[model samples]
Target chain A: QVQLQESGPRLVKPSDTLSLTCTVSGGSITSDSHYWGWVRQSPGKGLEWIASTSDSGSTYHNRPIYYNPSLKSRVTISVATSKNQFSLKLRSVTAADTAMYYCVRQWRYSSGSLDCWGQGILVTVSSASTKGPSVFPLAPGGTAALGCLVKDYFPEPVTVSWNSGALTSGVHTFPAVLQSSGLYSLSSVVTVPSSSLGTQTYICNVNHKPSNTKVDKRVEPK
Target chain B: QAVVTQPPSASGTPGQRVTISCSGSSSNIGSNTVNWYQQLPGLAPKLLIYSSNQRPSGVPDRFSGSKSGTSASLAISGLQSEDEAHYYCATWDDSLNGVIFGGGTKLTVLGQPKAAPSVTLFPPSSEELQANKATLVCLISDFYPGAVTVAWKADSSPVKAGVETTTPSKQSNNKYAASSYLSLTPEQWKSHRSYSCQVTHEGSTVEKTVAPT
Candidate 1:
C-alpha cells in the first residue's frame, strides 16, 4: 500500500520559479520496479505530462529529461533517495502557467502509465489583488445586517478576515468557496445593534498565501 | 514517438480460439523483441509471453505469441470463462529509448463453465534418491482457464527452499499443464521423509504425496 503526497507554494509572480516536492511512503524510492514523476492540468483544461525519473537518476522513458522540447528549458525533475521523495522545478512562470500540479507513481513496465496519484494543488502565477468586498445593508432603520463580498484571487486556498473598527462583537464569517476560474469567493456578515450604529467601521481583509499579498476593504454605511 | 497499437476487443466461445494483434514501426517492434501481458480487472498485469514467443516456465502453450515484420500477435485456444482478460504487447523503442505498449485488447470468453486440473507427483529414481541427490516433479494437467497456483511441502509443512515452477503451458487438446521441481540433498531427503505437491485451480485444491521407497 504505497502512497504519494505533493506540496508546494500556491502562488508565484510572473517570471519567478515554481517548485514542488512529492514524498513517497510504504516503499523505497530506489525500487527498480517503479518511476516517480509529475503531471499538471490547467484550470478546466487537459492534462500535460511534465516528466519522470527512475531510482538510478535517469529519465524513465530512456530519453533525456528534455524529451518534451517545449519544456526543455524550463523544467527539471530529480529524485532524492535518502528522503524517499522526488521534486519538480519549473522556471519563469506566467499567468498561462497557472495549473493544478500532481505527483504520481509510474510502474516500470510497458508504456509506464501512471498508477498512483497525489491530490492536486492549485498554483497561480498572478500578482493581482482579489476583487470586491462589496458591503450591503440587509435591514432598515438603525438596526442593520451588513454583507461583505470578495472574489477573483489567483491560487488557493485563501484566508478572509472581517473587522469592524475596534468593535469585535456580533460578527460572523462563512467558509471560502472555490470559483469557476480557480480563484476563491467568500462573504461575511455582521449584525449592527441600533445603539452602536454609526460609531463602528466595517472592513474586509483578504490574504492570498501564494503571492503573500493582502487586500483590505472598508465598508461605509449609506 | 514510440507507439504500439492493438485492437480494442476480441471474443471467443468456450473451447473456441481467438487471436489479438499488435502493430508497431521501425523504431520499436521492427527491431526489438516483443513481450505480452495478461491484466485482470483491478489487478496488476502479469507477464504472459516474453522475448516475442517464449512463455514463462509456468505459462500455458495455449497462449501462443508470434512476431513478423513490425507486428506481433497472441493466440488463445480453448478459451474459458476465466480466460477473459486484457492483453497488452510491449517492445523497446530505439528512437524514444523507452519501452512502449499497445493500447491493449480485451479478451471475452463467452461461457461460464469451469474444469479442475489433475495433479501428479514423481520422485527421483532409486539410485539418485539413495545417493541423496534427488529431485521431485509435480505435474498439473488438463486445467481450463489457464490459471493455477502450485506449492510444495515437506511432511505437511510448507517448503520454500530450492523450488522452481514452470508457467502453465497449453496442451494440444486445448488444456493447460505446468510443472514444479524440488531439489533435495541426501541428508535433507532422508531427514524430511515425505514430500507433497499441492495445486489449486478455480478454488479447488489437489495434493499428491510420495515417501522414500
Candidate 2:
C-alpha cells in the first residue's frame, strides 16, 4: 500500500524557482528497488519527464540524477533520505511554465518508464510580465501551436523566433499562404506550449522587416 | 506520433503463433536496436525483448524478436490467453536524434465469449459550432475484455476523414469505455441529415445514431 503525494505551490510568480516535494509513505525514497522522478503535463503537450533520482549506490544505469536534456541547466532533483521525501526545483519560471506536476516512481529498474504515479498537483506560474522571450505555456512538456498569421504585409513572411532563443527549438511551421488581396499573406504555426489549469495567456513575438508585433493569445479552459 | 509503424490490432487463438510487425526506416530500426515491451491494461509495460532479440532474464522464451533492415518483428509462440496485451517497439533514431516508438499493437487472443458494448451518439456541444468545426462524440461503454473498434458514419455513408477514436480504457466496474470524435465543418454538420457512432466488440457490431434535435 505504497502511497505518494505531491506537495507544491499552486501559484508561483514569474522569475522564481518552482519547488515541489513528493512525500513517500509505506515506502522510502532511499529504497534501491524504486527510483523517483518528476513529471509534468501540459494540456496541449503530453507528459514530460523532468528528472529522476535514486539511492547513492544503485544499478540503475548512470542514475543518482538524470535531467531532461533541454532543462538540464534549471532542473535539479534531491533525495532527502531522512525526510522520506524527494523534491524538484525548476528555475526561472514564467506563466508559460504552468502545468500539473506529478511525482512518479520508476518501479524496479525500467528507467525512462513510469510505473507508480501520484495525483498531480496543479502548479501555476503567475506574474505581470518579463523580458526573456518565453513560450506560451513554457513548454515544460514540449509544444503547443502559436499561429503566426500575418497578413497585408506587402512581403513574404520570414519571422524570427526559433533561432532567437526558443525554449525547445520549435516544431513544424506550417506553410504561409497568399490571398486574393495581392498583399502577401503568410500563415505560420510554430510550436509553443499550453495548459488547462485555468485561463492562460500565450505570447508570440514575431519580427518582420522593420516591424514587430507582440501577439497575446488567451486560452480560457475554465 | 512515432516514426515507426505498427498495426493497431492483431487477433489469434490460444496456442497459435502470433507475430506483430514493426516497420521503421534507416535512421531507426536499420541503424539501431529495437526493444519490445508487453503492456498489460492499466499497468506499466514490461520490457520483454531488448537489443532486437535478447530477452530479459525473467521473460519467458515464448516472446521473441527479430530485426532485418528497417523492419522488426515480435513473435509470440504458444500464445496463451493471458498473453493478450499491448506490444510496442522502440529504437533510437539517428536522424531524429531521439528514441522512436511504434504506435503500439493490441494482441487479442480470442475464442472466449466477450460482452458487447453499448454505443451512444451525442451531438455538438455548443456555440463552438458557430466557428469552423463542430465535433460529434460517440460513447462506447461496458464492454467486457475491453477490446473494441469504433467507426463513424454521416448518413450511414461510412465517414472517413476528421475521425479520431481513443483506445478502450477500463472503467471502475471492470468493464471498459471508449469515445470517438468526428469533426465536420459547421456547414456540413448542419446540412447532414444524420450521424452514427458504430462500435464493434468481438464479432458483432452495434451502432447509435443522432439526428437533428
Candidate 3:
C-alpha cells in the first residue's frame, strides 16, 4: 500500500505565511505512473485539490485562494531520490490561509483526485493582542504566573518565559499529555508577574520546540 | 495523430443483444481512460461510461464497461426496443491535442418477418419545432464512403414523414460527414414535442436532438 505523510508548522500569526511539505514512501515518484498533488481542508470543510505535478516537471493547478499567478514563473518541483520526499513553497499569506493541508497522490484516470493522502498539518493565523510587561512587577514575596494555550497539538514540549527587552527570568516548560484522540494538549505557565495591577509591561513568550514555534499572540496581563 | 476506428454497421435479430467494442492504440486508450457515448436520431450523444470502467450517475446497470490493457469495451446486455441506437467511444489523446471518438456503430432491431420492423421513436430535428426550430445534427465524419440512415421518433414510434437524411462528400480530412434535415409545417410545429435524429453507420449510432418548441 502507498502512504504519504505531511509535516510542517502548526501555528502562524495573522498576516504571516504558512508552509508545509509532503513525504512519500513505499513507491517511486519518478515513474510516469502518477502525479503528486496538494489538497487542503478547513477545520470542518470538504477536501479541495490545489495543484498537481508530474515527474517530468510539468504541472497543472486548480483555481484556489492565496495563490499568486506570478509565482508560477519560479515554481519548480523536484523529487529527492534518496529522501523520497517532495516539497512546496508559497509566498506571503494571511489569516485566511489557516487550514489543514495534505499532500496527496494524484491518480491519473480520476481527473487528479487524490487516492492517497497524508496526515493534515493545521496552520492557524493568530491575531490576538500583543501587550505585556515592560518591566516585571514583583510582589513583595509572591510569585506570578503568565501562561498561554497552544491549542490542538500532538505530543510535544512547550517552553514559556517572561521577557522585558533585555532581562528575562522565571522560565517554565511543560510536556504535553496524550488525549484519547491521540493528540497532545497542555499549557505552559511561567511565574513572573505577581499581579494584574502593575505599572510596566512584560512579555510572556511560549515557544513550541521541534517545529511549531508560536510565540504568545496575546497581551501579557500585568 | 492516430484516429479512432469503429465499425460501420452491426445488425442483430430482435430479442438478441449486441456489443460495440472501441479500440485505440498507446496514444489514447493506452495512456488515458475511454468514455462511451450514445446518440439517438435527433438527440445529442449522452456520456455513458467514463474513466474507462465507471458508469456515470443514473446510467443503467445493463450498460456496463470494462477495460483491458489498451482496449475498452461498452456492453449493452438484454437489448430492448429502447436500446436500438448508435454508440461511440471517446478517448483523450494528448498527442493529438484533442479528443478522438470511435467511428460509430448502429444497432438495428429486426422485427419478425411479415411485420414492419418496429422503429423506435425519438425527437425530430430542431427545424421541426415552430418557435425554436433550431436544426440540430450529428455528423460522424470518420466513416468515409459509407451509406447511413437518419430518422426521428416520438414515444418510440417513427415520425410521420417529415425527416430527411443524407451523407455529404468526404472532407479533406478523409472523413465523411452526414446531415439530417427536419421539415416542420407551420401548423404542426406549434405542438410541443421532442425530436431526435439518430445516425446509423457500421455498428454505431450517433444522435442529436433539438429542444422542444
Candidate 4:
C-alpha cells in the first residue's frame, strides 16, 4: 500500500538547479528500514540512476547520501523524515538533463528489488531558444505594418502587445505557432498611420511566462 | 560496492527455529544498524525488523533482529508456513555512501505445496476517460504461498514504463491475489499490435494478452 508521488517544475532553464520532492503515503519515510532514491530517463542516457538517501537516526549514523559516480559533484539527496518526504537536487543542468524522473523505494537500500515508484514527472531543461522579440519593416508607412516576431520559446503561453505609442491601431497578433523543432513563434502586426510614420516611435512588447522574461522593443519610424 | 552476504537459502519446518545471517564490514553492519525485510511470492517486501532490533507495530515477536561485530542476524522462532519467504538484511555502508542489502535468503516452510496463481489481463475499459491514456489490468488470483512478479509486454518486446503492481493481498479463502497495471497513451495503445501481462509464481509463468478493441 505504500505509494510515492513526485512534484517539481516541469520546465527549467539551462544552468539552473532542478529540485524534486517525493512524498510517501501509506508508509513512513522516517523508517530506518528503507531507502528512497531517484532515477531518470532521457533519450541520451536511457535510464540513469541519480541518488538515494536514508534516515538512520541521523546522529552518529548521520544521514546517508548516495549518488551516481558522474553526478556525485552536482547531486544532493536529503530526507525530511518528519514530513514523510525526501528530495533530490541536481545543479547546473542542461538540455541533456531533460527526462522523466522517477522516485523509487528500495526494499533493502540500493537493492535491485526496489518495490515502489512514483508515476514519474517529465522535466525539460529548456531546450527551446531564447530570442527576444524582433521588430522588422518599420520603414515610412502607407498602409505599412509593424511586424513583431517572438520566436523560439517553450511550454508556450506568451502575450504580444503594441505598447502605447504613436499608434496602437490595427493591431493583430497571430496564434503562436510551433516550429518543427518544438519551439513556438508568434507574430503581431500593427497598422500605423502614414503621418505617424515620420520620426514617430512604436513599441512592441512580448511576454513569456516560462522564462519569466519580457521583451520590449522601441523603434523609430523613418 | 558494499555487499552484505547472506545465505542463498534457509530452511525450517513448522515449530522450528531458524536464523539467517548477514555479514558486512565496519562501514555497514558494524557501525550502522540493520533492517530486515520479508518478501513473499507475488508481493512487495514488508519490513520485519527495523533499527536492528525494533519490530514494526503488528510484526510478531517471533521474528527478531540483532547485530554485533559488523554482522547481523534475523531469527524466526516457531516458524509458521506464513514465515516462509525471502529475507533480506540491509544497512548503511559508509564507505559506499549508500545503503546495501544482503543477497536475499529464501526461507522455505518444508512440505508445503508450490501453488501457481491464475492470471487474467483486461484491456483498457471503454468507460475510461477519453482524455489521454489507457490502462490495462492484470489480475492474479487463487495462489498459495503468496509471491509473484508481473511484467508487461508490447507486441513481442518488453514494455518498460507506466507499470504498477499491487502487493499480494489475502483473499477470502486464504489464497493470495494481486493486480498489476500498465498505462499507455491512447494512441500507443491502439497502434501497438498487442499487449501481454506475464505473471510468474513458484518459478512458473502464466501469461495473458489483450488487443485494442
Top model number, DockQ: 2
Candidate 3 segments exceeding 4 Å error:
A56-78, A127-222, B1-213
Put down candidate 4 lDDT per residue, B1-213, tens digits, no spaces: 356788988887789999999999877787788888776543345667878888777789899888899778999999787886778786766776655667678786776565788665556533342545466655576788779998788876899686656667555344677666576787888797899899888788898786765
Q: Residue by residue across A22-56, what tens digits does model 4's lDDT show?
A: 99987767656666888776632324557777666
CAPRI quality of model 4: incorrect
User: How many pairs collide in each candidate, listed in order?
Assistant: 15, 3, 41, 6
After superposition of all CA atoms, the RMSD between model 2 and the true structure is 16.6
Q: Which digits, one per residue and each the tens of the lDDT, describe model 1 over residues B33-150? A: 7877775542334568877777766678798989999999998888876677778786767786655567778776655456688665555544444444666656566688779887
Per residue, candidate 1 scores C-alpha lDDT tens digits across A109-221 of 54454556676667878776434332222212454555444433444655556662443465544344444444554444566756754675666666655656667666653
**Interface RMSD (C-alpha) of each candidate?**
30.6, 14.3, 31.8, 19.7
Per-residue lDDT for A1-222 in model 3, tens only? Answer: 567887766665665555667788777766555667665545433333355566634354432212213344324344565677876654455665566667766545533324465755655555542221111111113654444433334323444565532435543323333334344443333455445426545555655543545564433322
lDDT, residue B202, candidate 4: 77
For B96-165, candidate 3 gives per-residue lDDT tens digits of 5334556677766555232111112223232223333322222333353445676666534667464444
What TM-score does chain A of each model score against the native chain A?
0.61, 0.53, 0.50, 0.57
Kindly list the per-residue Cα lDDT of model 2 for residues B6-89, writing each as its tens digit: 898899988999999999887778778887767665444456887778776778988898999889999999978678777877
Order the candidates by lDDT, highest first. Answer: 4, 1, 2, 3
CA deviation > 4 Å runs, candidate 2: A1-50, A53-76, A88-222, B1-5, B23-34, B50-61, B67-72, B78-84, B91-100, B108-213
lDDT of 1: 0.67
Cα distance off (Å), candidate 1, residue B213: 99
Give the fraction of native contacts in model 2: 0.00
**Model 1 chain B worst lDDT window (10 residues):** B123-132
Better of 1 and 2 by DockQ: 2
The DockQ-derived docking category for candidate 3 is: incorrect
- DockQ for each of the predicted structures, in order? 0.02, 0.03, 0.01, 0.02
Candidates' C-alpha lDDT? 0.67, 0.63, 0.52, 0.69
